[PDB]
């Protein structure tokens, strides 16, 4: 039975609206992790329990080289804690905010890995992730993708079963989610198209500061590309960014498999992707496990330790991995 005294608390990796993430060391083992700490009080006030519980079940029920793993979750009187694989390499958001764009081959690599993980969520777990973006695509120390944040996943979605909940990130929302008229698992391919467009083109395919105008662009504007993008990249992006989910690459019964066959990925062997045999084309230059250079200096520079319906007890929240 795990508790907060099993860990040292070294650095703040970042702070979201419902909690914080702390780079931690487990005393007994020497192993570093990232621990998400949620005040229960905050969770309940914000109607954020369901997401948190969704996150706990999806993480328990998943094991893939490109999905952040859960080691432990446990609770104290006033708090919830998820002890996760630590993505040393930071967010691709950070990386693409410093480089203007990545090469086609670099995006192919990250693309392959994200496909491998979404495929597994869809076909093995019947999970729809729904919040793919650069902020949720993190790198590990070797430079492979680690997807994090599962609180917006939908569990239980099989074939063309539909969903109704308006959620995600505005810039990343698929046209059929903005139409508000039932959506399927092809929303994840629309997100894959947005992230890959950002990797290769250097910007979002549709932007406006104002959401309602953004959404209008997303529903109405024809996609355009920089004239240097190769024809196999364009075609992949065109297929992924079809506004009609029936016409979208990955929108049929074959799902990921249709994307996996696309000539942009030709010669990628999917099993080798799964075994991490692809050469990551950017290795993070981390000296050590406490080197947080790829994280936001906003949060990194801070040195802090802190160790009934408002503060309930979450039945069967706790969990330990290795099984």
């Amino acid at each position: 039975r795990v508790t907060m005294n099993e860990f040292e608390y070294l650095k703040l990796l970042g702070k979201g609206t419902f909690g914080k993430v702390i780079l931690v060391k487990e005393k007994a083992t020497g192993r570093y992790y990232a621990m998400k700490i949620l005040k229960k009080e905050v969770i309940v006030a914000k109607d954020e329990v369901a997401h948190t519980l969704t996150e706990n079940r999806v993480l328990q029920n998943s094991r893939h080289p490109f999905l952040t793993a859960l080691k432990y979750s446990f609770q104290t009187h006033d708090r919830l804690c998820f002890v996760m694989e630590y993505a040393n390499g930071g967010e691709l958001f950070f990386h693409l905010s410093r480089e203007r764009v990545f090469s086609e081959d670099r995006a192919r690599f990250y693309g392959a890995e994200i496909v491998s993980a979404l495929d597994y969520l869809h076909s093995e777990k019947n999970v729809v992730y729904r919040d793919l973006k650069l902020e949720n695509l993190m790198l590990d120390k070797d430079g492979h993708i680690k997807i994090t944040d599962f609180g917006l996943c939908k569990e239980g979605i099989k074939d063309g079963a539909t969903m109704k909940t308006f959620c995600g990130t505005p810039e990343y929302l698929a046209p059929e989610v903005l139409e508000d008229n039932d959506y399927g698992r092809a929303v994840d391919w629309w997100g894959l198209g947005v992230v890959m467009y950002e990797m290769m083109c250097g910007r979002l395919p549709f932007y406006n500061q104002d959401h309602e105008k953004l959404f209008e662009l997303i529903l109405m504007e024809e996609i355009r590309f920089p004239r240097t993008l190769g024809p196999e990249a364009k075609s992949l992006l065109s297929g992924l960014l079809k506004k009609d989910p029936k016409q979208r690459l990955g929108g049929g019964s074959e799902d990921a498999k249709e994307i996996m066959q696309h000539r942009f990925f030709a010669g990628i062997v999917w099993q080798h992707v799964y075994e991490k045999k692809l050469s990551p084309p950017f290795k993070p230059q981390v000296t050590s496990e406490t080197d947080t250079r790829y994280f936001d200096e906003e949060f990194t520079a801070q040195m802090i330790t802190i160790t009934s319906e408002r503060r309930p007890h979450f039945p069967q929240f706790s969990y330990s991995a290795s099984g």
Partner: peptide, 10 residues
């Protein structure tokens, strides 16, 4: 570089 984004649900 675009600004950082936030998710939502409702």
């Amino acid at each position: 570089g675009r600004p950082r984004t936030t998710x939502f649900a409702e």
